[model samples]
Target chain A: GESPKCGPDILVVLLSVMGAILLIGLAALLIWKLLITIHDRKEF
Target chain B: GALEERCGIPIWVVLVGVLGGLLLLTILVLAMWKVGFFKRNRP
Candidate 1:
């Protein structure tokens, strides 16, 4: 008999990985946008 | 739009989100890795 890939246990990891990436991406994007806005004003 | 126009949103909020997510990622990976996630040498 052959064992299949673990499902439930790895689901925790998958959830964390996706959540982390989303958080990081969103935060970075916000920061970048903020910087761009500040730059725009300074250029005025 | 008014609030964001003035850029009043605090950066710490974003920092906390980033920090919390990072900590979660690290903790889960470490816990799972130690719990024999990387199995080897199947007999």
Candidate 2:
């Protein structure tokens, strides 16, 4: 079966993808920072 | 007014609806990815 094209949903899909990417990126950065802090604490 | 319609629904509404669904899907995918749901294990 063929998949449906984005067609009219393009704008929504694009916006959603953008939002998701932004959210995940932010989360990843926070996680990285938390991990680094934890690692630093161990050294102190 | 110059509003557009598609499939009996407003085009903008359709776009908004899809965006909402995609946003949720993205979150699910992100969560799964972070949990290594897509990871492969060696036998």
Candidate 3:
């Protein structure tokens, strides 16, 4: 069967990539804060 | 009714939108904590 020439949808791709980047950035910041908290607790 | 797919977009895409926004909130709060933004009155 000849595949139709319908192009990839842009909105879905944009939203998904945005979500993934946000998720990774959030996780990184969360971990950084947690490390800081641990260091503060150990110092005090 | 919740999973309305307007313009052929999937409902899960909307879910990710909300999730991303919440993550943004989390990042802001954590960043503030790292900068001592919430420790104004602490002794």
Candidate 4:
């Protein structure tokens, strides 16, 4: 699954995937906070 | 879900669930595929 000379960058690939998950979690948290703020500011 | 599965899993529905689970992209599939290629004689 990999070239003879170029070994698999497995750790890098896994870290990138973890980073993606972290970024997604942060984005979801921000979105949730924004929704809460909008809800609090709404006139009802 | 395991408890529900213990009752009676329909054949067609089981096939559909398995298909749907395949679409879900579990890491097990990745590991299985990775090992399969490694196991095959590549020389």
lDDT winner among the candidates? 3
Pairs that collide, model 1: none
lDDT of 1 by residue, B1-43 (tens): 3433232223454455456677765776667558765433356
DockQ-based CAPRI category assigned to the predicted complex of candidate 2: incorrect
Model 2 agreement with the true structure over B1-43: per-residue lDDT tens digits: 5443322444675566556655675777689778865543435
List TM-score per model, in order. 0.43, 0.41, 0.45, 0.42
Fnat per candidate, as a fraction, reads: 0.03, 0.00, 0.08, 0.00
Q: How is the predicted docking of candidate 1 categorized under the CAPRI scheme? A: incorrect
Model 3, position A20, has a per-residue lDDT of 74
Error of 2 at B9 (Å): 19
Instruction: State residue A36's C-alpha deviation in candidate 4, in Å.
Output: 0.3
**Model 3 stretches astray by more than 4 angstroms:** A1-8, B1-41
Best-matching candidate per DockQ: 3
lDDT, candidate 4, B1-43, per-residue tens: 3533232433544455445444434454456558763243546
Worst 10 residues of 2 chain B by lDDT: B1-10
Name the fnat for model 1.
Answer: 0.03
Candidate 3 C-alpha lDDT tens digits along B1-43? 8543234555575666667767776777778889876564457
Task: Report per-candidate DockQ.
Answer: 0.03, 0.04, 0.11, 0.02
Q: Which pairs of residues clash in candidate 4, taking residues 3 or more apart in a chain or in different chains? A: none
